[PDB]
Amino acid sequence: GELETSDVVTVVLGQDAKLPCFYRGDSGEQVGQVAWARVDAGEGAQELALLHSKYGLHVSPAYEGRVEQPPPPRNPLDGSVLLRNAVQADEGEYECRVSTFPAGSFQARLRLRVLVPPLPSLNPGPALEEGQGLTLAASCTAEGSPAPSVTWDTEVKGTTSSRSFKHSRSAAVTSEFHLVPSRSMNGQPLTCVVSHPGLLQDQRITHILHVSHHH
């Protein structure tokens, strides 16, 4: 008669997170009350909600109006809750404590993973003239968690370098195309293609290159 729960739950930003906690008990045992706390290492523990065999769900003031029980019918032995509109601030571990009879109490943890897709930018390099050698065409910047994958799709010949800075809860990566300007390159599209887990369609933003004759 043990305690079923997920190992790590994954949502994309803005989706509702369903936190699993179902005590798969046999014919002679009931649950008394299920408490959901947030394992906060050093930031105390942040109580989400507790739900009681009789008196229902009491959602905590912090998550007031954010937590609710899954639509019925629900097994009376199930203490799962839904965290509405998941946000980056919710990443981390969560304790599901349950008190059962005649078994005793149990607890299970789970880690919640919030994917945040990027909102990329492209920024053109200097005015490109048919004269000069290797220079900046454009650079393309995407921050998200996990770190997005930024590449270039184009016809023209060129070299890239990139950088990838880990920030507190995400990672910004930037890439940049380099090329020797050629008038043959004018009006030709250079497009930046970013990919992310939280993105079912890879994002693509396009720059139309310009080059002028040596003057």
Using the contact rule CB under 8 A, the part of the chain among 19-27, 97-105, 134-142, 149-157 near a second copy is 97-105
Contact call for residue 61 and a second copy (CB under 8 A)? yes
C-beta of residue 141 within 8 angstroms of C-beta of residue 159 = no
Contact call for residue 164 and a second copy (CB under 8 A)? no
How far apart are alpha carbons 21 and 23 in whole angstroms? 7
| Nearest-approach distance from CB 142 to a second copy, in angstroms | 43
Contact call for residue 69 and a second copy (CB under 8 A)? no
- Farthest-apart Cα atoms in the chain, separation: 90
The secondary structure of 114-140 as a DSSP string is EEB----EEEE-SPEETT--SEEEEEE
Residue number, 33 or 151, with CB nearest to a second copy: 33
Contact call for residue 35 and a second copy (CB under 8 A)? yes
Among 27, 54, 187, 213, binds a second copy (CB under 8 A): 54
Contact call for residue 30 and a second copy (CB under 8 A)? yes
# chain residues binding a second copy, by CB under 8 A = 19
Contact call for residue 32 and a second copy (CB under 8 A)? yes
Residues that bind a second copy (CB under 8 A): 30, 32-33, 35, 47, 50, 52-56, 58, 60-61, 99, 101-102, 104-105
